[PDB]
Specification:
Two copies of one chain form a homodimer. With 122 residues, the first copy, chain A, is of the alpha+beta class. Chain A contains three helices and nine strands. Chain A has a single domain, classed as Roll (2,3-Dihydroxybiphenyl 1,2-Dioxygenase, domain 1). The longest helix of chain A is centred in the N-terminal third of the chain and has 11 residues.
């Protein structure tokens, strides 16, 4: 019986190195591998790939969900490095933590335009 | 210390219901939740979300990686339901299993255009 061990979302970016810097230097992920065309970052038990695209519209419409034990704690860690002005599409921003039927969560929009959601998980 | 438990890729599609049918009825995933705008499927320990997009170019440029214990076994299970003519972009297709420095893998292009890779994992 085939077992499904994990899934790796692929974020997209016109400028991969700049986006990798954000995830690593600002959000605290570690660089796994990569170059300007395809890179990978990781933190804890999860990994994320970042692929180069020639179309900004693709990056602005790419998203991913990540399950963490404590969304609030993570939000607090980043509150000092990321703008809380989500409406300000001028750059990366983070939303407030909110309650949903599925638990607390918040989202981060990286410099490339990807929207990544962080939700409470088990 | 915040723990990262899992990641959920988000596939995109102009026709979400048609894509969900493919993942569930053809690839054997189970329907978690959803409607025509946003749905979720799952198999084993992993989940995938499918979001509606108005731009086909986004779907054709969306991808994801999934780690499984045995790529060949999975490929064999699907060899009877999916076309092995990847070049035939007329519809869903699957590539042969190939060897990479990171192990054996293959890819599937679903009806919506997303490209999902299945690689050997631990």
């Amino acid at each position: 019986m085939v077992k499904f061990l994990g899934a790796v979302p692929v974020l997209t970016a016109v400028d991969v190195p700049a986006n990798v810097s954000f995830w690593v230097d600002t959000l605290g992920f570690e660089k796994d591998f990569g170059d300007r065309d395809f890179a990978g970052v990781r933190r804890g038990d999860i990994r994320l790939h970042i692929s180069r695209t020639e179309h900004q519209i693709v990056a602005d419409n790419t998203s991913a969900w990540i399950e963490v034990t404590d969304p609030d704690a993570l939000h607090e860690e980043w509150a000092r490095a990321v703008s809380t002005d989500y409406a300000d599409t001028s750059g990366p921003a983070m939303t407030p933590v909110g309650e949903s039927p599925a638990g607390r969560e918040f989202a981060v929009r990286d410099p490339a335009g990807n929207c990544v959601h962080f939700t409470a998980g088990e």
